[PDB]
Design an enzyme around this catalytic site. Sequence first.
Site, PDB file in Angstrom:
ATOM      1  N   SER K  88      37.924  44.252  45.658  1.00  5.47           N
ATOM      2  CA  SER K  88      38.318  43.954  44.289  1.00  5.47           C
ATOM      3  C   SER K  88      37.135  43.477  43.654  1.00  5.47           C
ATOM      4  CB  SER K  88      39.380  42.845  44.431  1.00  5.47           C
ATOM      5  OG  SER K  88      40.435  43.229  45.272  1.00  5.47           O
ATOM      6  N   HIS K 113      40.970  48.273  43.559  1.00  6.44           N
ATOM      7  CA  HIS K 113      42.507  48.388  43.318  1.00  6.44           C
ATOM      8  C   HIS K 113      42.488  47.812  41.841  1.00  6.44           C
ATOM      9  CE1 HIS K 113      43.981  44.224  44.237  1.00  6.44           C
ATOM     10  NE2 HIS K 113      42.586  44.148  44.644  1.00  6.44           N
TER      11      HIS K 113
END
Lengths: 179, 179, 178, 179, 178, 190, 192, 190, 190, 192, 190
Positions: K88, K113
Site C-alpha cells: 500500500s 491496491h
Amino acid sequence: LSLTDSVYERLLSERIIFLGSEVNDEIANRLCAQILLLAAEDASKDISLYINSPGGSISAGMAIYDTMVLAPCDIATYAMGMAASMGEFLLAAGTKGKRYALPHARILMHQPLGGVTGSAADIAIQAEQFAVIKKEMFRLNAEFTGQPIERIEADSDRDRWFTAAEALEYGFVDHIITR
Amino acid sequence: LSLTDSVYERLLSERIIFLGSEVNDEIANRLCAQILLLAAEDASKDISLYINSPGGSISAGMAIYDTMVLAPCDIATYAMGMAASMGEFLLAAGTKGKRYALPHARILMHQPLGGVTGSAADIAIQAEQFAVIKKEMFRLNAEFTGQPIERIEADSDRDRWFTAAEALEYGFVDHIITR
Amino acid sequence: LSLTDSVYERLLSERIIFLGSEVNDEIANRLCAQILLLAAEDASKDISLYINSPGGSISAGMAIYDTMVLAPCDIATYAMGMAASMGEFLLAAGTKGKRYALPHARILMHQPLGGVTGSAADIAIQAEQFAVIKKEMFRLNAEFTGQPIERIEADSDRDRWFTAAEALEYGFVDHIIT
Amino acid sequence: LSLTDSVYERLLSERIIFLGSEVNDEIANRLCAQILLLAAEDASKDISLYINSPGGSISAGMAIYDTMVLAPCDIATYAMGMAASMGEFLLAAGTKGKRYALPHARILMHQPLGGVTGSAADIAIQAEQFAVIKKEMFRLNAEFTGQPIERIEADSDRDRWFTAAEALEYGFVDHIITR
Amino acid sequence: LSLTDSVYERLLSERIIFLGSEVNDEIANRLCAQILLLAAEDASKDISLYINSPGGSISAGMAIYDTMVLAPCDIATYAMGMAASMGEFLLAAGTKGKRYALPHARILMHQPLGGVTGSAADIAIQAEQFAVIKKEMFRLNAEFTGQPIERIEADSDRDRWFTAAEALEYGFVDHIIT
Amino acid sequence: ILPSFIESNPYNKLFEERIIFLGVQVDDASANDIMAQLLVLESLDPDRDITMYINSPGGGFTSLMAIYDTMQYVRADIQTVCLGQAASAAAVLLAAGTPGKRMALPNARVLIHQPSLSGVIQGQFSDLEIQAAEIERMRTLMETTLARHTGKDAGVIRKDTDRDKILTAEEAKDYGIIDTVLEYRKLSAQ
Amino acid sequence: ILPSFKESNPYNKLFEERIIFLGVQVDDASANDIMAQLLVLESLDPDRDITMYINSPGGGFTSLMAIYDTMQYVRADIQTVCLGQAASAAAVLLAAGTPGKRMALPNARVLIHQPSLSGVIQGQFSDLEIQAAEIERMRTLMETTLARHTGKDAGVIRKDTDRDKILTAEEAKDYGIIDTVLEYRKLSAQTA
Amino acid sequence: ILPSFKESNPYNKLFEERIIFLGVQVDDASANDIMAQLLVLESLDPDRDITMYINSPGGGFTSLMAIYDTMQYVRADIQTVCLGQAASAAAVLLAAGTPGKRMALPNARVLIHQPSLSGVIQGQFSDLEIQAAEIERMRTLMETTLARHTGKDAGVIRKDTDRDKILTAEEAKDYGIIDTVLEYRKLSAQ
Amino acid sequence: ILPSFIESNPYNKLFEERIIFLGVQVDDASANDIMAQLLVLESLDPDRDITMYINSPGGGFTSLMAIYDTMQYVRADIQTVCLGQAASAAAVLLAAGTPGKRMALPNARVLIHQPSLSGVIQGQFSDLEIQAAEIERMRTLMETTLARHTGKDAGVIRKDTDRDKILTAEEAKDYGIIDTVLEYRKLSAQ
Amino acid sequence: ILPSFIESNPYNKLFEERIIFLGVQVDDASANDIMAQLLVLESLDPDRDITMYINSPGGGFTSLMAIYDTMQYVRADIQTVCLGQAASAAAVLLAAGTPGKRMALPNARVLIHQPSLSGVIQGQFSDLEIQAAEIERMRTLMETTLARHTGKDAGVIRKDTDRDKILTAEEAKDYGIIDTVLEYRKLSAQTA
Amino acid sequence: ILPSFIESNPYNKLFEERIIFLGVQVDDASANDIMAQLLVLESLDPDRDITMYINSPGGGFTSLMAIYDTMQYVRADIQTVCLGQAASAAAVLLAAGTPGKRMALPNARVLIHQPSLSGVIQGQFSDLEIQAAEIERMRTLMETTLARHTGKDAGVIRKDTDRDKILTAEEAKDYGIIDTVLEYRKLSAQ
C-alpha cells in the site's frame, strides 16, 4: 406451561411439593403459597415435601418453617439427594414421625454465613443480630433433633456431614425409606 | 401462566395476595391492581397480604398504603420471614387488630435512604424534600405503632431489629399467629 | 398470559388503565390503544387512569394527551404514589372535576430535559425547537392549572415538589380521595 | 407447549423419559418428579429411561438412583449415544435384566471430580468427604456390574472407554438391542 | 396473548394498525402482512394507520408505501405524537383527503442518512445510489405535499420541524382531527 | 508536568529543608515512604523540627498507625500543616503534630469520622464476630488517639465522629485539632 | 514522589545502615529481593546484625519459608521490627528474629491464622487428596515454626490459629512473638 | 513530543524565569505541584512576580482552596494570565491574582458556575443532610472569594452563577475577574 | 523496591560471584537470560563453579531443555541451590546440577509431575495424534533426564510422577534429586 | 523508534533551529507544549522567525484559541508550513502565521468545517440554551478569525464552511489560507 | 532487546551512515519522525544520498503524502530499499525514490491496491457525497503519483490496482516500482 411445570402441577394435585434449589425469597414465597393452597383445599391429608437443596437464606427458610408449622395438615419431609444448611433445617422440621431420608441422601449441618459491610456503628448492630440468629438456629435444631444445644453448637462450627443412618441416629430423620 | 402464576391466581381467588420482593413501581402497581380488583369483586370480605419484603421505594410503598387505606374491605397483614423498611411500614398499616406476625418473623425499622446529585441548588431542593419525607414517614409510623414521634426518631436512626414479641410490644403487629 | 397481564386485562374490562412507568414510546402506544379500545366499546362511561410515573418523553406524553382529549368519554386521572414531569402533565390533563389525588401522592413539576449534539447548525435548530417545546408545555400547564404562564415558568425552573394539598391549591387536582 | 415439550409429553404418556443433558439439580428433580408421577399412574408397568449424558453431580445422580430404586415400577435403561460418569452410573442402575445399550454407544467410567476451596481446616473435611463419596461410588458400581471393588478402583483411575460389547462383557448392560 | 398484543389484535379487528417505533425490516414486514390480511378480509372499508415513529430505513418504508398504494381499501394516516423521516413520508402517503394530524403532533422532514465503507470503487457505487435514492424520495415528497421539488430539496437539508398547523399549510396533512 | 532537570525537583528542595509531603492516600506504599523520610531526617539532624504537609483524603488504618508511631518515635518535633484538606486518617496525623506546631491555612477543612469498611467481609458468623470485634477495637483506638491529642474525652469524640464532622480551620483550632491558622504573608497586601 | 538527597534515596540509606524493608506482600519477587539483600549484608559484615522492618499483609508459604531459611541461615543476627502490622506470614517472620531482638511499635498489630487456599483447585479426587495432604503438611509446618519461636506447644498454636487471632504489641509480647514494645524517644515528650 | 536541550525542557526553562503553568485539571496531583513551585519561587526571590498561565477546565474544590491559599500566602506577587479558558475553579484562581496583575488574552474565556456534584453520593438521609450542608458551605465560600476579589456582592455573584456564565475577556474585565486584556506584542504588526 | 548501594544492586553483586537466580517462571525470556549469563560466566573463568539459585514454579518444556543443555555444556560445573520451592521444570534443573553439588534449604520443597498440556488444542484427529505423540515424547524425555540424574530407573520415575509428588528437602535427598540439605550458619544458635 | 545521534534527537535539532512541530491532535496537552515552546523561543531571541510545522487532524476549540493567541502575542514572526494535512483547528492555525510566511507542500490538504459537538450534552432546556448560545459564539468567532486572516467576508466563510471543505495547496493559495505552495528543491531534478 | 556497543545501538549507527528505517505502519507519528530525520540529514550534508529501508504494511494516506513530499523536497537523492515487503502506501514511497536508486531484496514483496476506507463513515447524504468525492480525489492522486514514478499510464494503474496486486522483486522491476534486485554479496560461495 413447560413440561417441568406440567409435571409439578400434576404432582401438586397429589399433594407433593418440591424444594430443589437455594432457599431464595422467591422459592420460599412459592412454597408458602403452595402450602397455603394445599391446606385450603384440604386440611386433613398430608403434604409431602421433597428436599434436594444446598441451602440459602435464613429468612426464607423461616418463612417456610412457620408456614409448615401453622398448616393444619402434617408435612412429611423426604431428604432426597442432598439436604444441606437450610434444607437440613426444613427436613428436620417436618412432622415428627414423618421425616424420611432416602438411603443414599446426604445431610450437611453448619453454622450460618453472612457479611459485614457498613461502618463501625452499623457493624456492631450486624454482629448483634448475627449472635441472635445463630442462637435461635441452634435452639431450633436442638429442639428438632433432641440433641443438647451445646452439642449442636460444637458440631456446627464447621461442615458436619451425615449419611442417612448417621442422620437417623442423630435425630434429623425418623426413618430411612426402603422398598 | 407458569406454576407460580397459577398458584398465585388460585390464592387471589381466595383473597390472598403476596408481597415477597423489594417494593418498586412494578410490584406496587401489581399490588394496587389486585387490591382494586378484590375490592370490586366483593367489598365486604377481607383481604390478606403476606409480607416477605426487604425494602423498597417510598413512593411505591405509599401508593400501596393509600390503596389499602381506601379499599372498602379490611386489609389484614401477615409478616412472614422478613418485614424490613417499607415492608414493616405496610405490615403496620394493616387494619388495626388484624396485623399478625408469624412466630419467627423479624421486623426491621430504619430511616430512609437516598442519593443527592447535581448542582448545589438541586442538592438543596433534594435535601428539603428528604426532610419532608423523613418527617412524614416518622409521623405515620408513630401513628401506626402508637409511639411518640421522638422515639421513632430515636430508634429509626440505625437499623432496629425486632423479633415477633418485641414487635408486638412496640405496636407493629397486634397478634402473634400460633395455630 | 401472566398474573400481571391477567389482572390488568380484568381491570381494562372495568375501564381502569394504568400509567405506572416512565412515559416512553411503547407505553404511550399501548395506552393510546387502550383508550381507543375503551372509547370504541362505550362512548359515555368514564375511563379511570392511575398515574405512578416518574416522567418520560414529551412526544409520547403528547400522544397520550391528544388521545385523551379526542376520546368521546370523560377521563378521570388518579395520582397515586407519584406523578412527575409528564406524569403530572397527564394527571392535570384529566377532565376538570375528575382529577383526583390520593392523600400521600407527590407531584413534581420541572422544566423539560433534553440533549444537544451534532454540528453548530443542527444545534441551532435543536435550540429553536427546545424553545418551542418549552413554551407549549408551559402554556398547556397554565391552561390546566389556571395559573398565569409566568408562575408556571418561574415555579418549574428547577424542581417543584407538591404534596396533595399543595397540588390542590395550585390546581393540578380537583379533589383528594378519602 | 413447544414442539420439543409436546413430543416429550407424548412420550411420557407412553412411560418413556429421557436423560439427555448433564445431571444437575434441575434435570434430576425433573426426572424424579416424572418417576414419581409414572409410578403413581400405574405401578405395574415398566419405565423406559434413555441416557445420553456426559456426566453430572453425584448428589443429583443419587437422587435419581434412589427414586429409581424406591419406585414400585421396574426401570429399563437404554444407553443411546453416550453414557459417561453419572450417565453410566444410572445406566447400570436399571433393573437387572432390563439394561440395554444401543450398538454404537460409548460408556465412560472414571473417578469423581471436584474442588477444594477454603482454609486448611475446611479442606480436611472436604478431603474426608471425598474419600467417603469415592468409596461409596466404587462399592455401588461393583454391586451393579458384578466386578470386584478393586477392579472398579483400578479401572476408574483415569478414564475407561467401553464399546457396547465391552460394556456388556463388563457388566454395565445386559443386552445390545438390535432390530 | 399478552395484554399489549391482545389490545393490538382487538384493534386490528377494527382495521386499526399502529406504527409506533423505528421503521425497520421487521416492523415493515409486520405492517405489510397486516395490510394484506385486512385487504383480504374486506376490500371496501378503510384502514386507519396511526404513526408515532422517529424514523427508520428507506427500504422498509418503501415496502410499506407500496403495500399501501396497492391495497384496494383506502388508508387514512393519523400522526400522533411524532412523525419523523419515514414516519412523515408514510403519513403524507395516505389517501389524499384522509391524512390527519392530532393537534399536538410534530412532523420532521430531513434528508436521508447513511454511511459509506469499503474500497474506492464500492464507495463510488454507494454515492451514486445515494444520489438516486435522495432524488426519488424528494420526488415522492413533492408529489405528496404539492410543493415544487426545489423547495422540498432546500428545506429537507438538515431538520425542518413542523407543527400540526404548519404541516397542514405545507401539505403533509389534510385535516387536524378534532 | 512538574519542572525539574537532571534532579532539582521541587519536592527534593522541600525535603532538603525537612519537609515531608503527604499529598496522597494513606496506604502501605506512601506510609513506608513517609517513615523512611522521617527516620532519615531524624538521623540527619535529630534536634531540628520535621515539617509535614497534609493534603490527603485519608486511608487505611494500619498505615495511619505506622505513620503515627513513627511521628511519635522520632527525636525531632513534628510540625503539621493542613493545606487543602485532612480527611479521615490524615486528620489524626494533623492532630498528632507537636502541640503548638499544628497549623492550617484559612480555607482548609478537616473531616473527622469513624472507621468504615471498604467493601464486605464474608464468612462464617464466627469469623464475623472476630472481624467486628477488631473493627470496634480500631474505632476505640481512634477515639483514644484523638482524645489524647485534642484534650477531649473519648466519649465526646465518639459522639462527634459517629457521622461525618467537617470543621473549617477555625473550628479545628477550637476543637483542638490544630493550634494556629496561618495568616497570609503577602507583602503588597500590607 | 519519594525525594532524593552522592545522591541517594531513603531506602538506600536504610540499606547502608543494614536495614531491610519488608513492606509489601510476601511472594516470589519480594522473597528473592529479601534473600539477595540478606546475603549481601551478611557478606559485607557477617558479625553485625541485620534489621528487618515488617509492615506486610502476609503472602505465600513457599516465599515465607525461603525468607525464613535465609534469615536463620546467615551468620549475622536478625532484629525484626513490626511497624504498622504483620499478618499471616509476616507474623512468622516477625517471630523468626533472634530472641531478645524482636520488637514492635506500640500501635502495631500482629495477625496469626492458619493457611487459607486462595481460590480453588479442580481435579480428580486422587489429585485433591494429594493437594489436601500438602496443605495439611504446610499448616503443621507453620504451627511447628511458631511453636519453636514462641515457646508454646504445637497444639496451643493450632488451637489459637484456628481462626484469625489479632494481637496488639503487648498481647504479642505476652504470647511470645516479640520481646519488647518500642518506647518513644521524642525529647520534648520526655521533658514533660 | 516535547523537545529538550544539564537537560532542560521548556517548562523548566520557564520555571527558571518564574513562570508556572496551570494547564491541567485541578486536583491534588496538580495542586501539590503548583504549591511546591510557588513556595520554591518565593524562596528563590520573594520580591519578583510569579506569572501563572491558566488554561484549565476546572477541578476539585479542596485543591482550588489549597492553590488559592498558597497564592495568597507567598510574599511574591502572582500575575495570572488566562490563555484558552479558565472554567469553574480556574476562574477563581484567575481572579485571585494580585489586583492589577490579572490578564487574559483577547480570545480567552472564563466560565463561572456554582459547584456541582457529578455522580451520586448515597447513604441514609442523615448522611445526605450533612453532605448537602457541606456543599452549600462550599458554594458560599466560592461566592465569598469571588466577591472579595471582584468587588461585587455575594448575592449578585450567587445569582449570576446560578447557571453557567460564559464571559469573554472584555466581559470578564468589566466583571472584575481580570484587570486588563493583553495586547499583542508582535513587532511586525506594530 | 530493591535498594542499590556504592551503583551495584544485590543481583549484580551475586552475579559478580557467579550466582544465577532462577526465581521466576521458566519461559523463553528467562531461558535466554540464563543462557546468556551461563555463557558469560563460562567465558570469564571456565574452571570456576557456577551457582544456580532456584525458586521457581516451573514452566515451559523447551525452555527447560534449553537451560538444561546450556548447563550441561558449559565447561564450568553447576551447583544448584533450591530456595523455597523447585517445582515442575525447575526440579529437573535442580536435579541436573553437578553430582555432589546439589543443595536445598531445610524447609524447601520439590515437586515432580509429568508434563501437562495447558489449555486445549483443537484440530483434526491427525494433528491431534501428532501432538499426542510429541507429548509422549516430551514425557519420556523428562523421565530419561530425571532417571539419569537421580540414579533411579525411567519406569520408577514414570510411576512416581503419575500424580504430583511433593518432597521435602530430606526426602529429595533420599530420592536422589539433591546431595545435601543445608545447615544454618548462625552463631547465636551454635 | 526515533534514532538519536552524537547527543540530541531530530526534534531537539529542529527546536534549536526554531522549528516547533504540531504533529498531533490539538488538545490541552499539545497546546501547553506549543505555548511553552513559543514562549521559550521568544525569550531566547525575540527578533527571529519561529517556524511551525502543521500535520494534525484538528482538535478542541479552546486549545485552538490558546495557540492562536500565543502565536499572535509573541514578538517573533511565525511561519507555518502544512505538510500532510491541516484539518479543522489546524487550518485556522495555518492561516494564523504572519502574512506572507504561510506555506504548504504541494500534496497537502486543508480541511475547514464549522465546529461540531461530538458527543451529547444533556441537561435542562435552560442549560441547553446557554450551551447553544456558546456554540454559536465560537462558530462566529472562528468565522471572524478566518475572515480576518484570508481577506474574505465572514459571510463567505460561513457559507463555505457549512459543510466540510477540502482544499489542495493550490486551492488554499487561491482561497487565502496560505501564500505560497512550496516547490521541491531537489538538486538532481533541477539539473535534469 | 537491542544490544548496544562501544556507546550506541544499531539504529543510531545506521543513521550516522545516513539510513532511515521505515519499519512500522505509515501513520502520523512515523511520518513526523521520518520527516525530522530527512531534514536533519539534509542539513548535515545535502550532496550525499539518504537511504530509506522500507518494511511496512502501509498505512494512512496523508501521512504517505507528507513523507512523499519531504522525500521529493530535500536537496539530497533518496535511495530506497524494500526488505520484507512494501504494501500500500509504502510501495509508493518505494517507487518515489530517485530513478536509479530504487532496490528490493530478491524475496521482497510489493503489494499495491486502491485506497480503502477502513471502518464506516456515517452522516447525511450531503456529507457522504463530499466524503466520496474526497476518496475519489485521493485515489486519483495515488494513481497519478504511481504513474509519474513508474512511467506507466494512470489508466493502466487504475485497472491494475483495482484489486490487490502482489508483485515480487522482478515483477516490480518490470512494473517500474524498483530499478534493481539486490544480489547477495556473501564472499563464500560467491
